[PDB]
Amino acid sequence: GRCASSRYLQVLGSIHDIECGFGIDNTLSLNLQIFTAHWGHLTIILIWVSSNLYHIASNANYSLWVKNPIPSMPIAHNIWDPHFTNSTSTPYSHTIITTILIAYSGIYNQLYTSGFNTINQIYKTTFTFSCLAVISILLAKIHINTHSELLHKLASHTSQIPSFFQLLYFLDVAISSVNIRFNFHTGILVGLFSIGYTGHLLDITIPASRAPLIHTSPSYLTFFGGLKSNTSSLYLTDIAHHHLAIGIISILTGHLYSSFRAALGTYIRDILYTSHLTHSIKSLHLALSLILASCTPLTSTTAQHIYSLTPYFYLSYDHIYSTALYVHHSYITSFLAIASHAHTAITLVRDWVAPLEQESSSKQIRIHTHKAAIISHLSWVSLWLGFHTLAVYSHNDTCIAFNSPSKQILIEASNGQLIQQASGKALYGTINSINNYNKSFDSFIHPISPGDLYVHHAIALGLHITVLILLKGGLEARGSKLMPDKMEHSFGFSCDGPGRGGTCDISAWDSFYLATFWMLNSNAWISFYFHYKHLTPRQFSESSTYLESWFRDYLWFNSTPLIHGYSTLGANDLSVQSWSFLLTHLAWASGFMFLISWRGYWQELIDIILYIHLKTPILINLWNGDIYTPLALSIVQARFIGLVHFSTGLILTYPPFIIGATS
Amino acid sequence: EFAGGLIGGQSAFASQEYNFDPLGLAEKFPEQLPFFREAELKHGRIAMLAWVGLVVPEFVRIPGPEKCWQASAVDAHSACVXXXXXXXXXXXXXXXXXXXXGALTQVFIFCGTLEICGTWAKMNPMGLTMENAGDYRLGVNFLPDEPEKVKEMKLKELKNGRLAMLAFGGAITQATLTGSGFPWLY
Amino acid sequence: XXXXXXXXXXXXXXXXXXXXVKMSPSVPYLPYPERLEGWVGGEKGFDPLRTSDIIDVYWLREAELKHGRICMLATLGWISVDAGWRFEAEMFQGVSVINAHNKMVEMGVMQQMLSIVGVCEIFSLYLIKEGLLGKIQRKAGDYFIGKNFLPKEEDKAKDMQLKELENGRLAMLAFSGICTQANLFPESHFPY
Amino acid sequence: SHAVKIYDTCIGCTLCVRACPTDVLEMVPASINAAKQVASSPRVEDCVGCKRCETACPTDFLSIRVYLQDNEETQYSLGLDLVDWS
Amino acid sequence: RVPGGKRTQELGLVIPMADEDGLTDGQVAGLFVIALVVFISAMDLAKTMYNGINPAKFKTSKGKGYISPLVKRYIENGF
Amino acid sequence: KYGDQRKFAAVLVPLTTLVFPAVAMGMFVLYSFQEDAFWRIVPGTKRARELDEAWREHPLFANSKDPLDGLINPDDYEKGLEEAWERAKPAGSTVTVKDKLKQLSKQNNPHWESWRAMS
Numbered sequence A: 001g002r003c004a005s006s007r008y009l010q011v012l013g014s015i016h017d018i019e020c021g022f023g024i025d026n027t028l029s030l031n032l033q034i035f036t037a038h039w040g041h042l043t044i045i046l047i048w049v050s051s052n053l054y055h056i057a058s059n060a061n062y063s064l065w066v067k068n069p070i071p072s073m074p075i076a077h078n079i080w081d082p083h084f085t086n087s088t089s090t091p092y093s094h095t096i097i098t099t100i101l102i103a104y105s106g107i108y109n110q111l112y113t114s115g116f117n118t119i120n121q122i123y124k125t126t127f128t129f130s131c132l133a134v135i136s137i138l139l140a141k142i143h144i145n146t147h148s149e150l151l152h153k154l155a156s157h158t159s160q161i162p163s164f165f166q167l168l169y170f171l172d173v174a175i176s177s178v179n180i181r182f183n184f185h186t187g188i189l190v191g192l193f194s195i196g197y198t199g200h201l202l203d204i205t206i207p208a209s210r211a212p213l214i215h216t217s218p219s220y221l222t223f224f225g226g227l228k229s230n231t232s233s234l235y236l237t238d239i240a241h242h243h244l245a246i247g248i249i250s251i252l253t254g255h256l257y258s259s260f261r262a263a264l265g266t267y268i269r270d271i272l273y274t275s276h277l278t279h280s281i282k283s284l285h286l287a288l289s290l291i292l293a294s295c296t297p298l299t300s301t302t303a304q305h306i307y308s309l310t311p312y313f314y315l316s317y318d319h320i321y322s323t324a325l326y327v328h329h330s331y332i333t334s335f336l337a338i339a340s341h342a343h344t345a346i347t348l349v350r351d352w353v354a355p356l357e358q359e360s361s362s363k364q365i366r367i368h369t370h371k372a373a374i375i376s377h378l379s380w381v382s383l384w385l386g387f388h389t390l391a392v393y394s395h396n397d398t399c400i401a402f403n404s405p406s407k408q409i410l411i412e413a414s415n416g417q418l419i420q421q422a423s424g425k426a427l428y429g430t431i432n433s434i435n436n437y438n439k440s441f442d443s444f445i446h447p448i449s450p451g452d453l454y455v456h457h458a459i460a461l462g463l464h465i466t467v468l469i470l471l472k473g474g475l476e477a478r479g480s481k482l483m484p485d486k487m488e489h490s491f492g493f494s495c496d497g498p499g500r501g502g503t504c505d506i507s508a509w510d511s512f513y514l515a516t517f518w519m520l521n522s523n524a525w526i527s528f529y530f531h532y533k534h535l536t537p538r539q540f541s542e543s544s545t546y547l548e549s550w551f552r553d554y555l556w557f558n559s560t561p562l563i564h565g566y567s568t569l570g571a572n573d574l575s576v577q578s579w580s581f582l583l584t585h586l587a588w589a590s591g592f593m594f595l596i597s598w599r600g601y602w603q604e605l606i607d608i609i610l611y612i613h614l615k616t617p618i619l620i621n622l623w624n625g626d627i628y629t630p631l632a633l634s635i636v637q638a639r640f641i642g643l644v645h646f647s648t649g650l651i652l653t654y655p656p657f658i659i660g661a662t663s
Numbered sequence B: 001e002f003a004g005g006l007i008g009g010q011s012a013f014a015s016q017e018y019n020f021d022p023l024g025l026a027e028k029f030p031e032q033l034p035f036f037r038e039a040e041l042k043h044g045r046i047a048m049l050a051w052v053g054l055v056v057p058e059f060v061r062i063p064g065p066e067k068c069w070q071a072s073a074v075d076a077h078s079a080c081v082x083x084x085x086x087x088x089x090x091x092x093x094x095x096x097x098x099x100x101x102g103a104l105t106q107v108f109i110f111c112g113t114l115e116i117c118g119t120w121a122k123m124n125p126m127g128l129t130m131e132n133a134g135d136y137r138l139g140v141n142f143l144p145d146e147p148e149k150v151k152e153m154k155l156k157e158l159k160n161g162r163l164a165m166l167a168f169g170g171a172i173t174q175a176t177l178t179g180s181g182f183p184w185l186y
Numbered sequence C: 001x002x003x004x005x006x007x008x009x010x011x012x013x014x015x016x017x018x019x020x021v022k023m024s025p026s027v028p029y030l031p032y033p034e035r036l037e038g039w040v041g042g043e044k045g046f047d048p049l050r051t052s053d054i055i056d057v058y059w060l061r062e063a064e065l066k067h068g069r070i071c072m073l074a075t076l077g078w079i080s081v082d083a084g085w086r087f088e089a090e091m092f093q094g095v096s097v098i099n100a101h102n103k104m105v106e107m108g109v110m111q112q113m114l115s116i117v118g119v120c121e122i123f124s125l126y127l128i129k130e131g132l133l134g135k136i137q138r139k140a141g142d143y144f145i146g147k148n149f150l151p152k153e154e155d156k157a158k159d160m161q162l163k164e165l166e167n168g169r170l171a172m173l174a175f176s177g178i179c180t181q182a183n184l185f186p187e188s189h190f191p192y
Numbered sequence D: 001s002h003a004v005k006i007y008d009t010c011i012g013c014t015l016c017v018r019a020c021p022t023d024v025l026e027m028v029p030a031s032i033n034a035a036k037q038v039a040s041s042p043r044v045e046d047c048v049g050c051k052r053c054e055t056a057c058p059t060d061f062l063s064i065r066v067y068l069q070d071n072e073e074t075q076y077s078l079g080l081d082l083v084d085w086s
Numbered sequence E: 001r002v003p004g005g006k007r008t009q010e011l012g013l014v015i016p017m018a019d020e021d022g023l024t025d026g027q028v029a030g031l032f033v034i035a036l037v038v039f040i041s042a043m044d045l046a047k048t049m050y051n052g053i054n055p056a057k058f059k060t061s062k063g064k065g066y067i068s069p070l071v072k073r074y075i076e077n078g079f
Numbered sequence F: 001k002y003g004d005q006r007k008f009a010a011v012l013v014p015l016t017t018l019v020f021p022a023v024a025m026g027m028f029v030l031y032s033f034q035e036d037a038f039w040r041i042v043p044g045t046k047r048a049r050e051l052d053e054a055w056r057e058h059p060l061f062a063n064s065k066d067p068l069d070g071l072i073n074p075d076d077y078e079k080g081l082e083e084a085w086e087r088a089k090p091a092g093s094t095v096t097v098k099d100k101l102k103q104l105s106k107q108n109n110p111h112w113e114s115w116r117a118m119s
């Protein structure tokens, strides 16, 4: 016997699930594979950085954008596509000149702020980052060899006593050690990296931004505030001082755990054992979940503070950079946030040992004892938010459709206004006690209106429901009342049969699949809020309390330039935006059939098609189907493929709209 | 046993042990007693050399960078380092002086190199204990071969070091308060 | 006592007698680094900073030889160019060694040499890896050149390999003084 | 092939055996219930995985449990008709 | 270029293009050499990850393995 | 001119987006028919068996798959268990600890990892 066509999907669904590998027999192999994969991924990141730097160096106009950044537009890379018109000139080129694309990433402001002035510096930087990619791959090879050499040194290893087998658990102490990793991460990788970047700023960035000054004196460490007037960005001296302070704090903190000597520092196990934790820190899924849950606030605050307090030169002067960066980082942090819950569920399925029935000692145990209370209250708050946001929006829509704008229910956002007032009083007290006052903070505090209150309630509803689905999946991954053996099965499995009431979407993976739709919807709400407030603050402040305003004055109204991109009147430089808009609509709708239509129909359809192929004159004498038997996609594969189509469509439909509306 | 059985705690009236530790740090920190004795001996040796070189420059002054090599013993540190950029940071924009750079940072880097390949190499790599606390195996051939002679020589080193530490503190404080010569008096 | 102690588990360890430890001859207060035993210079047993406690000696001896060999040539190059030995061809009138580097990279002959050094070093990188990985039969810093003038007395070879290291170490400290003295005092010569 | 396991809570219904469409299950004598019989799954290589046996089992939680193994599918566990894997 | 979007037309935003080349062909070739080095090393790394660790090397491979003196300390320092 | 980089594009773009992808797809479909294909996720491959046996040959990982591995002195454990069961044996019970454990270890699951019979 052999396999069917579903082998490809089955293999690719766990192609990186190194725990599911067949040759892997021990944590040594798993940890070494993960470490080597980390090295390869770092190489990929470095090559990507070098790629962007090269294309800015070669197929771009950094040397000219740096001179007049406010009205100029950067170039991403050239367009070489043989499908364009070999005659005339495309709307993306100045007549006979080559074809170009406008960069919406923001690397131009990054390099300008960091101190780049010439193309030659960018070329040297590209070369150095390619060198670093080589170094990373060679480090991967080095560590593979060192661990294989330890394994070979077990050919000259014996304790002369039966305790020699204890060495089995310490072979991967290089990777699995936690105290040393925490100490050196928090100290070196955070604090000293910040201190080195402060040195970079003081040596290059501040010297290459103003007239020549003293030999990088300590007057380069200022405490001004935000939004230097000329470049509309944070003071580079303030940034250097901030990185210096963070570096000092994290360097001091990095001396906490017992890393290299047994006589200094406290152990993480003893820290947890005397607190409300003591979790299984040897689980890789648990660590991954709680660090993905750490990159999530970091990325969300990155999205918030790149816009609110623009740190790069002339970044606020670009109407497309500011929206694209915020939306990108919001989507990245939403993905990481749902990742944290997905891997928490995988941790509970795979890497969690629980007491017999009643020992309420582990934190997961105490959570599982009253998990029903958690889920019931999360459902209650989700229901309240949904009911009272949709109902008030419906009131506003109905009363404004009935020619009565004054009959709306507009709750003044008093709590957010109080927080803003307190923060503004603090900031104004800071500013008034300065001999160099009249500072600006850009959008750190923004006008808050009833529309803001309603949108914040909608966002809270989305977050609550996403957390509800993910938390329910995590807590009932090991067993629910409907299926009280769920931890005997895989993390993702089809169903439990039509009996016992019917059990579609019962696995924890199915809970993740359901929660990804709500993650996408909440992110869409957040991005729509930001983009609408960005396009017209006045119209958002007044007419955003009724959903018809969102439907008309934002979606229908702002989609005018994009659809007009390519038509029977000529093309604009938004032609790619409109074409990708339609393509992403097609991708989004194509995944509906993988979600709505389920397997058996298609399996019968595939049986009919296979009947045809085994009935066609020439095919039957070459291919009997016994080798790679065509079969319909399995249930979990179908749900995942539909989810991928839906996610791709929903995500990639937005950047064309952003570019058409802002540019 | 007091302080892990270290030399230095014995009284001079004999038949008695001063075992001076009013704060009781020896019993509070028995795992850092070798480090405590390392620090005590390092302070004592540095203070001996410091007192000798606090007295000597009042008579002879090496003829060198006139920016330093001049003034009272008090105005000899901040003068022999000059207005460095922030602290012990060489000015790479204008090496060769012409405004601000150190004159002792050479002593600083020599001390750092010696210290790292000295104490740090003694503790971190493949080991200091109670007995080999200040023992860097420097001039041990001069140490007599007798169990009590080595002990009394170590005791004399320790007591001279403590006396030199207190003496340097007093000498530098009096010099700052008054100036003056070797007596360091008003 | 070569072993760090004598025990079965590192909780009831019995440390070796203090007078019985092997001890380094260079740094008398440090125990001998046993990882260096077997290599050429492993009789002065000098490794404080413990950089061989962490890194395979094959790497360090590869780096030590490359530094010494490159410094032995660089010291000779600086001395000869300073004493005045410009190559026979014209376009080589750099007047001074300190400005020879920037002068020649402008002319275009440094880009050629950097390529030729680059390819040989990439070939060296392949050799170093497979040499470490025990796949090829290659020692540290052994690019298989010469090997006919290498003495074959199993002890004279030890001396010559040691002689290469000692001259390499001297050149490392010699060139650093040569280059540093040149910049401080532009008076430029092997005597200075 | 899937994995069909029978647990001690079986009460000899024979409903699981009757519901199986590929004769995977059978009744064996036993002494752990008043029916003096428990189910067995000697031929799970023919178990398609329809889980009708689980639908038919009336114990509080199923005395017969079918564990799906998709990376394990054989021609019999897939119900291949147009194609032979032998 | 034929601009699209209201703001580009109503503000006069323009996209300057350098009349020079950017990078010469020699610089691109210099980058491609190191890119090829990355490529070869990455193919080797992919092979090694695909095949995984070989534990049976101690029966055939030469040498006797090695545990660095710090790795031993990290082993006996704890976990 | 601002062009003259298109000389690189006219070779690289067709190459890496047509020749390399087609060669990759052909090589992938060829690899799909190797006996080693997807040996880490597909059960019953020869290389998986060889890797498992190679792991078992290592002196550290000989008794690694045994869930009961760890008992330093299994004879002491068995003797203590037998002694504890003797004082709690119900009346004239005829079951010993040894055969009880022997029959509790031997289950009847013929269709478990039967895919270890082809490669």
Ligand code: CLA
Residues within 6 Å of the ligand: A586, A589, A590, A591, A592, A593, A596, A597
């Ligand atoms: C927009 C979304 C979308 C799309 C594209 C399809 C497409 C299809 N559905 Mg479907 N379906 C959808 C949504 C969608 N469905 C939804 C929401 C449901 C609700 C459950 C269903 C329910 C459903 C059922 C129940 C059935 C179908 C069937 C079909 C197929 C018949 C049409 C056909 O063969 O045309 C061809 C497919 C196209 C997409 C046309 C365009 C093809 C492109 C434009 C040309 C080729 C592109 C080119 C080669 C690029 C190469 C790729 C690139 C990587 C190089 C087809 C694959 C029927 C079927 O399979 O019977 C034959 C069928 O029985 N669908």
Ligand code: CLA
Residues within 6 Å of the ligand: A376, A377, A379, A380, A383
């Ligand atoms: C006797 C009626 C009754 C009572 C006292 C409660 C009480 C409660 N429900 Mg509830 N519920 C009910 C009926 C009822 N429910 C019905 C019929 C449904 C099906 C739609 C639900 C669906 C439901 C959900 C989905 C959730 C609750 C929750 C809750 C708790 C929080 C309060 C809340 O969310 O209310 C809000 C209640 C609703 C949104 C449901 C609609 C209310 C129905 C229509 C009232 C029917 C009353 C009945 C007709 C009275 C007839 C009397 C007559 C025969 C004499 C609370 C313990 C939440 C929870 O567990 O959090 C702790 C929660 O998440 N309920």
Ligand code: CLA
Residues within 6 Å of the ligand: B046, B047, B049, B050, B052, B053, B054, B056, B057, B060, B061, B062, B063, B068, B069, B070, B071, B072, B073, B076, B077, B080, B104
């Ligand atoms: C802790 C010890 C110590 C320290 C920090 C200083 C620091 C200083 N001395 Mg000073 N000095 C010392 C000991 C010390 N001295 C001793 C012991 C003597 C007697 C020989 C002198 C004699 C001396 C003179 C004559 C002068 C100074 C001066 C100075 C200032 C300029 C630096 C200089 O060139 O010194 C020069 C110092 C020396 C040449 C003596 C070095 C002796 C060292 C401490 C011994 C080596 C220690 C080594 C690490 C251990 C291994 C060797 C061991 C076997 C002995 C500076 C503030 C100058 C100045 O401006 O004064 C105001 C000056 O003119 N010193």
Ligand code: CLA
Residues within 6 Å of the ligand: B109, B110, B113, C026, C036, C039, C040, C041, C042, C043, C044, C045, C046, C047, C050, C051, C052, C053, C057, C060, C061, C062, C063, C064, C067, C169, C170, C172, C173
């Ligand atoms: C890059 C130069 C270099 C390298 C890689 C090596 C490598 C090696 N040497 Mg070696 N050596 C060198 C230069 C070098 N040497 C020089 C210049 C001398 C003359 C003093 C010696 C003298 C020497 C002796 C006497 C012995 C060795 C030995 C060894 C081996 C073990 C030591 C070890 O682990 O250090 C390898 C790692 C390094 C050298 C890295 C050091 C880098 C640090 C951070 C720089 C610190 C110096 C810095 C420039 C000074 C600061 C300036 C200012 C602040 C004062 C190893 C093969 C031993 C041996 O034969 O064992 C088999 C031995 O007995 N060496």
Ligand SMILES: CC(=O)O[C@H]1CC(C)(C)C(=C=C/C(C)=C/C=C/C(C)=C/C=C/C=C(C)/C=C/C=C(C)/C=C/[C@@]23O[C@]2(C)C[C@@H](O)CC3(C)C)[C@](C)(O)C1
Residues within 6 Å of the ligand: B048, B049, B051, B052, B138, B139, B140, B142, B160, B161, B163, B164, B166, B167, B168, B170, B171, B174, B182, B183, B184, B185
């Ligand atoms: C190969 C090799 O090399 O081997 C080496 C090995 C080894 C061990 C390193 C060596 C050594 C030994 C050395 C170098 C020993 C040096 C010892 C010194 C300089 C001791 C000074 C003490 C000063 C004191 C107590 C001051 C006391 C001052 C006092 C009490 C002052 C008291 C005042 O009242 C007075 C007098 C004035 C008042 O105004 C105030 C004050 C100042 C307090 C060798 C010999 O080299 C050989």
Ligand SMILES: CC1=C(C#C/C(C)=C/C=C/C(C)=C/C=C/C=C(C)/C=C/C=C(C)/C=C/[C@@]23O[C@]2(C)C[C@@H](O)CC3(C)C)C(C)(C)C[C@H](O)C1
Residues within 6 Å of the ligand: B074, B075, B077, B078, B165, B166, B168, B169, B170, B172, B173, B176
């Ligand atoms: C000033 C200056 C500088 C400096 C400096 C320096 C190095 C300053 C150093 C100051 C220093 C080193 C000050 C030591 C004090 C020691 C004390 C107080 C000891 C008390 C000890 C006492 C009170 C002991 C009492 C007892 O004996 C009694 C009475 C009975 C005995 O039975 C027991 C005990 C032991 C209990 C710069 C910064 C380098 C440059 C700047 O430009 C100029």
Ligand code: SF4
Residues within 6 Å of the ligand: D006, D009, D010, D011, D012, D013, D014, D015, D016, D017, D038, D039, D053, D056, D057, D058, D059, D062, D063, D064
């Ligand atoms: S249906 Fe369930 S309880 Fe009845 S005989 Fe079958 S396995 Fe036993």
Ligand code: SF4
Residues within 6 Å of the ligand: D004, D019, D020, D021, D022, D023, D024, D025, D046, D047, D048, D049, D050, D051, D052, D053, D054, D066
């Ligand atoms: S799953 Fe279906 S085929 Fe398999 S044993 Fe149960 S009833 Fe029979």
